[PDB]
Amino acid sequence: FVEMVDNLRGKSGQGYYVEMTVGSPPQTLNILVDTGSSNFAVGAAPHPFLHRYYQRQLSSTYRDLRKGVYVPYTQGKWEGELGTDLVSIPHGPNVTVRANIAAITESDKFFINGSNWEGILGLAYAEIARPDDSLEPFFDSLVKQTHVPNLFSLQLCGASVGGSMIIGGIDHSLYTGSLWYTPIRREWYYEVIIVRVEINGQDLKMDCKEYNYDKSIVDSGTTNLRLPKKVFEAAVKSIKAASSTEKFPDGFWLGEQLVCWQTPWNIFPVISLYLMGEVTNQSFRITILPQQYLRPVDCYKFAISQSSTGTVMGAVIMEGFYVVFDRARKRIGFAVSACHVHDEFRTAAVEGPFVTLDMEDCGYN
Numbered sequence: 001f002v003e004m005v006d007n008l009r010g011k012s013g014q015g016y017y018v019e020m021t022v023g024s025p026p027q028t029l030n031i032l033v034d035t036g037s038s039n040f041a042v043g044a045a046p047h048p049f050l051h052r053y054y055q056r057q058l059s060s061t062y063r064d065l066r067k068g069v070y071v072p073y074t075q076g077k078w079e080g081e082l083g084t085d086l087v088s089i090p091h092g093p094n095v096t097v098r099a100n101i102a103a104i105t106e107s108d109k110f111f112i113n114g115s116n117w118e119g120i121l122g123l124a125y126a127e128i129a130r131p132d133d134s135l136e137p138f139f140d141s142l143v144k145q146t147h148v149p150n151l152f153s154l155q156l157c158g159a160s161v162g163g164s165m166i167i168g169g170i171d172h173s174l175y176t177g178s179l180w181y182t183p184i185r186r187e188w189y190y191e192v193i194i195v196r197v198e199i200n201g202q203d204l205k206m207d208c209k210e211y212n213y214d215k216s217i218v219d220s221g222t223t224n225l226r227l228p229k230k231v232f233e234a235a236v237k238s239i240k241a242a243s244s245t246e247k248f249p250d251g252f253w254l255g256e257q258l259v260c261w262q263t264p265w266n267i268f269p270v271i272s273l274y275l276m277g278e279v280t281n282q283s284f285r286i287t288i289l290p291q292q293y294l295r296p297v298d299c300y301k302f303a304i305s306q307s308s309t310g311t312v313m314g315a316v317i318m319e320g321f322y323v324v325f326d327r328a329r330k331r332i333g334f335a336v337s338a339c340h341v342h343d344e345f346r347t348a349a350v351e352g353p354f355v356t357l358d359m360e361d362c363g364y365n
């Protein structure tokens, strides 16, 4: 799968993109890779921020669906016209498929000024597609029309970022140790269940329901580890305590201020999420280093932040790990990334099995 290794580019805070082609003849575009949504959408008009855009008039294979589509994210909304056309990933599998494409014709605080991407690839399930679940998501179309296995994996490497999207398989060269899998609780977002949390090794004795209210998801289109309220205060409480030996401003834990050195790494704790495992009463844990939740912006940004719609395991989480979206078996795999920025002293980690009871009662119903 070395054809696909290192096919992801980006800039810190601006997402990860892959090169795609649309229409005949092929128009090359950079497309943000987003496991947190299920629309395939590309700029189709000359918005001043865009390096390029989809020009339907140039395409033999374009077909109008004569439906409008609207999509608001956490922030950012766009509106568009649905169509289908032929699509390829040059540094991906050797195929071409007909896919739904939203030609973005109006947007609001969506495109990033200074970014080098022109669209977004929603990789999650139909259930959350707009206007509705009859709009077959890209990856569903990819699997139905080719012999590409129903699986993709992400090694997000973390001012320029790099990484790999392996479509249809796994590249064992992108990780060390063993993959550990957690069930996809439901096929809409990539929903999982967190069952326990630990800073430097200390539990938080919270009802595990507080971790998955109203959901926990794996989202590559989100930068931060985003915890619910209770959970966020508790974890800074614990990190501020473990790291107290150097005084840090309040702006820095709000993610406003910066720290600058010429970096006492082991001043800072590891953070640990236990995930529901494959077997009744068995879990595993994933552990991130300071080198993960501290975003280089020799200065650093605290990258854990409060949330509101559930836990979101964003690039802060995913940059420590190789993440396998095993859609065929309703599960997501985590393994230590071979590219994660580590340490002579420490590493990010994933280990098990652990015994943890009542893992069902952990997710909101």
Ligand SMILES: CC(=O)N[C@@H](Cc1ccc(F)cc1)[C@H](O)CN[C@H]1CC2(CCC2)Oc2ncc(CC(C)(C)C)cc21
Pocket (backbone or CB within 6 Å): 015, 032, 034, 036, 037, 038, 071, 072, 073, 074, 075, 076, 109, 110, 111, 112, 128, 129, 130, 217, 219, 221, 222, 223, 309, 310, 312
């Ligand atoms: C930070 C952010 O919102 N990133 C988005 C993609 C994105 C948007 C703009 C941008 F400039 C870069 C990436 C992700 O798609 C967010 N993913 C989840 C993340 C959550 C779900 C829990 C937090 O909020 C979302 N709300 C709406 C959508 C779109 C929908 C059509 C599926 C309802 C998705 C999400």
